[model samples]
Target chain A: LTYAPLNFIAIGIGATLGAWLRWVLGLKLNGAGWPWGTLTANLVGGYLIGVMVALIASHPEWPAWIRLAAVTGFLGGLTTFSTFSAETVDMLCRGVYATAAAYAGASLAGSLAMTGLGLATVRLLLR
Target chain B: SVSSVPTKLEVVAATPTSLLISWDAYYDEVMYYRITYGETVQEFTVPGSSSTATISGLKPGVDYTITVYAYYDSYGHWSPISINYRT
Candidate 1:
């Protein structure tokens, strides 16, 4: 639902926080091996997104800002597919084809499973 | 003066085995240079006063992105001017 400046404000704030945390944490964690930092962010972001989806679905009366801020904005900032792609391609360029596949594989399947896990667990929480 | 650091980047195929690369010198406190190529990401370094060089041992018919980083005494230039070429 197209709504107010309040919705945009929510989005901007959520995005800022998510990006800030993502950048700071990534700097500390991402180095030398596997880029565990990015994977960690994506997995956690995915789970939070699942939880947000469940919450929004359960409450139609709530404002769209919840969905926009949590899902579109926060998720957008925290989950970095661009860095993932760049890292993967970098691996391939360096001739680590297998490593690239594993990173991509873990990120894709693991993130999805985390999402499902979040949805299922939060559903139980709502009950 | 007019957007400082790396006014331009230039490169030539020269031959499959070698290529010539150069960039506009940032004359000031700056005094070093680093060049990075796309494919292998093999990085090359040169002195600030000498901004031109030729290198060998390159694969033919591959596209390469060449970037120049001009460095100074206090700080290193991260805003590199990257240009593309194919051999």
Candidate 2:
């Protein structure tokens, strides 16, 4: 496959910012008896990716690297599946099965709903 | 798993955000090579004759684990190799 060498630069730039934002948000939001930080990062990442995807779809003038930079690079760093899995399994290990189930359900369901909401909002705006 | 695994797999930072991954084919019996990397499991393939690929748009200063699989058309075997890298 062809390589867009400069796309790497774009991704690096976006990812640096994304990771920092997520890091700070995590510090601010975690440990309310659950992983609010992880959920927030994941949900926002999902929604933003959907919004950017919609934007890229309608705005042909946008550069191709934007997808790699914003979606793959930024959102990839912003979301944390490892932490999510760790926290969920920790709950399970502690016999907090009910909390684990709720966290799992909320993360998965919220991500899908937020992403769909983002796509729909953009689609409606564009229309 | 029967075919010979690839060797000398190297992942060098071409840039802070990109890597140059290359390997040795070791045998001509292979059909293609599949390369997968990162926790996200981003993956792709290269032809049997090919032994190198460049991945861009990555988060810098992070550790990554990459795996290479040699798929043999003639041997009906898939050999695997792995490496860890810090960019």
Candidate 3:
């Protein structure tokens, strides 16, 4: 279900906030190995998505704007696979093989772990 | 201006090579095309009766520039300077 202008406005605002947080956190934790900013955003986004999905399924009459704001707006903005891929390609082209390998492996491993943690935390709290 | 127009433009691929060259051809025109190239120019032309040619033997991740021109009616007119598209 499409939302009205207010839905978009809320999504955009949330997206901006999420993007800013990701950038700031990433910069602060730079060179610590893993991309903490993107990881945090992805895990958080994933968990929120799961919970939202569950809520919508249970309620059925939930406001569509809520989904739009969180899923399509905030989380989508927070997680950027395109940037990740492009950065990986650039690293490979620059002959930074070791860095590229480490980044790819770590991002995959860390993101999955974080997603699980987030989902588990939310489910436990709800229960 | 009025006397100069492109007759043909074709892209040629060198099998596995990613470099594609585009050249110009015109109707009722008699002139040889000239290609200027560098790593920064944005246009190029492949010459010969093939109407188009592919440049093989290129290093990946390297920037290339290319330009093309035409000669007609005792006058050689250059196409608007363009460059090779780096894949």
Candidate 4:
């Protein structure tokens, strides 16, 4: 919706960093054509959002910029599902059906599990 | 004597390299925000001016978990607990 200077900056920073990270993950994962890195990032980002929301609600005195910068800007830049979708599509277009299937399934399943794990871990620690 | 509960926790993005985090403010008579993140649950304080913060320089594509707490300003009463998402 509303785009500001920080919004574009956040997108740029996120895209740049995300791209670099993707490359690194690809190398580390041996280009298994898997979206492990992307999935993991999404899960973690989702969990963090939950935590930040709780903290902010409890402390309303915090500045608006803090939320914009950290929650909206940083986390926004960090997680991306669109790219994951595109990559999977690309694989399919290239006729890597099996790889594409694997990528799609893994990304979905892995991300969900990781997110749940993150949430549970936090709850456990707090208890 | 209101019991505080954490809510509206959300992660805007979870990229390989960074995480953008935000959340709704908790209802408490007195408290401050603190974050425990990273492998060691490293602590980072909110700037007290905004509802968001950025955690950067992380390994791209790795999962990171964060926890948020509210410390009472008058008597240092902390809320139960809140968990967050980090990429």
TM-score of each: 0.59, 0.57, 0.48, 0.42
TM-score of chain B of each: 0.82, 0.82, 0.55, 0.69
Error of 2 at B12 (Å): 55
Q: What DockQ, on C-alphas, does every prediction get?
A: 0.05, 0.01, 0.01, 0.01
Give the docking tier of candidate 3. incorrect
Order of quality (TM-score): 1, 2, 3, 4
Candidate 2 lDDT over A1-127, as tens digits, reads 1277888887888788889878777666764355677789999998998898899999898777888789878998898788788778756744668988999999999999999988998999987
Better of 2 and 3 by TM-score: 2
lDDT of 4 by residue, A1-127 (tens): 3456765665566556655654455334322234455665666666666666656666689866556655675567656768677767756644668878887777677656665665566556665
Tens-digit per-residue lDDT, B1-87, candidate 4: 544434555677766777777766665432346665674245566633356777777785566676655543311334545554545
> Candidate 1, residue A105: CA error in Å?
0.4
For model 1 chain A, where is the 10-residue window of minimal lDDT?
A: A25-34
Please provide, for model 1 over B25-62, each residue's C-alpha lDDT reduced to its tens digit, 9 standing for 90 to 100: 76564545666777726766676678688766778898
Docking class of 2: incorrect
Flag clash pairs in model 2. none
Worst 10 residues of 2 chain B by lDDT: B70-79
Say which prediction, candidate 3 or candidate 4, comes out ahead on TM-score.
3
